[PDB]
Amino acid sequence: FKVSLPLRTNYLYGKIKKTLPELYAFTICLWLRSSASPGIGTPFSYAVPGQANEIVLIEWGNNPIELLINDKVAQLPLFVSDGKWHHICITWTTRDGMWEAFQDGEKLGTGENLAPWHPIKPGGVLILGQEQDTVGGRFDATQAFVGELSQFNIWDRVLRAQEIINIANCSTNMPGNIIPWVDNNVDVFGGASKWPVETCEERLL
Amino acid sequence: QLQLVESGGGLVQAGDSLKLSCIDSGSTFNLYAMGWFRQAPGKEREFVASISRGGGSSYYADSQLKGRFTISRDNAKNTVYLQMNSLKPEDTAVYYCNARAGRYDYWGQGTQVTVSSAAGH
Ligand SMILES: [Ca+2]
Ligand SMILES: [Ca+2]
Ligand SMILES: [Cl-]
Ligand SMILES: [Cl-]
């Protein structure tokens, strides 16, 4: 299924029902399609007490898309603000804070020194379509994501290149061992809805 | 004959300003034409600007950079500066200072500049 976020607001959003444990590494993958053109905004964000920008993917207005971990920034080589469906995976490891960015199964770059040695704080709130300024709230419409999201999954390891290809190709459907994409793990609010999603091939048409 | 140290860099928000400085410990600074280069993540080190020994002439990589950056020097302080205005995220890079005279070229170790739209927001 897909989540539909049809309008730039500070009140429509999805909420992952599960929280995160303390992560020393992760992979976050998802399909997204954005209507919005001065920047896709914020497909997802993770806020904890102490730090509302604990994990954030945000392309705010006409700026380079950024990953925040613990409010520390890296620019990613994702190019997904073309109004078409795209699959993305981000991997990261506490060890030397090394990240990788994959788009449509292809690795587009890597970097180091993003929040190195910082474990991800457990217990926070994962929001779809909005950027958090408090745990679970204080949304900003100029940062909101407008469009559709599907197959948002989180694992607590760095998936291998080959696994990402298969996910991007949807020749795999194995759910995130931490955050699975299932109906009862994805609540919607304020106008956000859920719908059957086109097949992988239909999308990329 | 030269040991350059850059400073003034750090975490800053988009739209903000910042002034780098580059200092020689020695006392023959005015022999040298001075320059700033920068290197962003997985990209080639690129020229920003240079300034003649006396500070009467300066050169920019292109008009976009010239529009927002100013190179200057103070030979009394053995220092070259880089004023950077209206900083963009794409200005994020290690900034390196560079001294040249005859066939001798010297470099500093660089100072980190990070410009983020989203950090803090
Ligand atoms: Ca925030
Ligand atoms: Ca915000
Ligand atoms: Cl709320
Ligand atoms: Cl697994």
Give whole-number Cα distances, A111 to A23, A94, A96, A134, B79, in Å. 19, 12, 10, 28, 33
Shortest distance, CA B73 to any CA of chain A (angstroms): 32
Picking from A63, A72, A75, the nearest residue to B41 by CB comes out as A75
State the amino acid at position A47 in one-letter form.
Answer: A
What residues pair up with A128 in beta bridges, in sequence order? A14, A44
Residues from chain A that touch B90, judged by Cβ atoms under 8 A, are 64
Q: Do B121 and A140 touch (CB under 8 A)?
A: yes
Q: What dotted CATH number matches B4-116?
A: 2.60.40.10
| Domain locations along chain B | 4-116
Q: Do B89 and A63 touch (CB under 8 A)?
A: yes
Residues from chain A that touch B121, judged by Cβ atoms under 8 A, are 53, 60, 131, 133, 140, 143
Q: Resolution in angstroms, to 1 decimal, for this deposition?
A: 2.0
**Domain boundaries A2-204, CATH class:** mainly beta
Q: What are the phi and psi torsion angles at A5 (to 5°)?
A: -125, 80
Task: Give the closest residue to A68 by CA, choosing from B74, B11, B1.
Answer: B11
Shortest distance, CA B66 to any CA of chain A (angstroms): 21
Shortest distance, CA A17 to any CA of chain B (angstroms): 24
